C-alpha cells in the first residue's frame, strides 16, 4: 500500500495532513504526494498517487478499481475473485479464482484457457460464431456456425 502497482502488459495476439470536512468526508495528504479521499460513511475510498494513478475502493459494491495512468489501463477486482483488465484498444482480460483466463480481443474474438483438465489446450469463439477447440495431443475440433463439425487428427 501507499506505493503504486506495476503496470500490466496485454496478452499476445497469438507532514501527514488529515483534513476532515464539514459533512464528515476526509482528505489525507501524504508526504510522497499521495491524496487519500474517504467518503463521510467510510465506504468509498480513492487514493490519488503521485504518478497520476488512481485506486478506488467501493466497500458497498465490493470492488477495487485501479487506473494505470501511464498506460491508460483499468483493473477491477471483485469480491468473488474475478479480476478484469481493460486496455485502451478495447482488449479485456478476465481472470477467476479457479485459474480460468478469458481474453476479449478488439476484433470480437474470445480466447478461453484453463490449466485444469488440459484435455483441451485453448478454446476460441469468433465474431461470426465459429468455435475452435485446440487439444493437448495436437488435435482440433472446429464447430462452424452453419452446423459443420471439423475433427482434425494427427
Q: Say which CATH number the domain at 86 has.
A: 2.60.450.20
Give me the phi and psi of 100, to 5 degrees please: -65, 130
Helix ranges (H only) for 5-153 are: none
β-strand pairing of 120-125 with 26-29 = unpaired
User: Phi and psi at residue 89, in whole multiples of 5°?
Assistant: -85, 0
Q: Indicate the length of the chain as a whole number.
A: 154
Residue 37, CA distances (Å) to 17, 40, 82 in order: 12, 10, 25
Identify the residue whose cell numbers are 459443420: 148
Is residue 21 within 8 Å of residue 27, measured between CB atoms? yes
Distance CA(37)–CA(17), nearest Å, equals 12
With H, G, I as helix, E, B as strand and everything else as coil, classify residue 64. strand
Experimental method: X-ray
135 and 120 in contact (C-beta within 8 Å)?
yes
Parent domain of 41: 1-154
Q: Rg (Cα) of the chain, in Å, rounded?
A: 21
- Sign (positive or negative) of CA dihedral 122, 128, 129, 132: negative
Q: State how many domains the chain has.
A: 1
Q: State the resolution, in angstroms.
A: 2.6
151 membership: H or E segment, kind and range: strand 149-152
Amino acid at each position: 500500500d501507499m506505493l503504486p502497482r506495476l503496470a500490466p502488459r496485454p496478452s499476445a495476439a497469438v507532514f501527514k495532513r488529515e483534513i476532515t470536512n464539514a459533512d464528515g468526508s476526509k482528505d489525507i495528504w501524504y508526504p510522497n504526494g499521495n491524496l487519500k479521499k474517504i467518503s463521510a460513511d467510510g465506504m468509498n475510498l480513492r487514493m490519488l498517487y503521485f504518478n497520476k494513478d488512481i485506486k478506488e475502493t467501493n466497500i458497498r459494491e465490493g470492488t477495487v478499481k485501479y487506473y494505470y495512468a501511464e498506460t491508460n489501463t483499468w483493473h477491477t477486482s471483485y469480491l468473488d475473485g474475478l479480476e478484469i483488465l481493460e486496455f485502451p484498444n478495447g482488449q479485456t482480460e478476465h481472470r477467476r479464482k479457479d485459474g480460468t483466463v478469458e481474453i476479449h480481443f478488439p476484433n470480437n474474438s474470445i480466447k478461453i484457457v484453463d490449466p485444469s483438465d488440459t484435455e483441451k489446450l485453448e478454446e476460441w469463439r469468433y465474431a461470426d460464431g465459429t468455435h475452435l477447440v485446440q487439444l493437448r495431443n495436437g488435435d482440433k475440433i472446429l464447430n462452424l456456425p452453419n452446423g459443420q463439425k471439423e475433427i482434425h487428427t494427427k
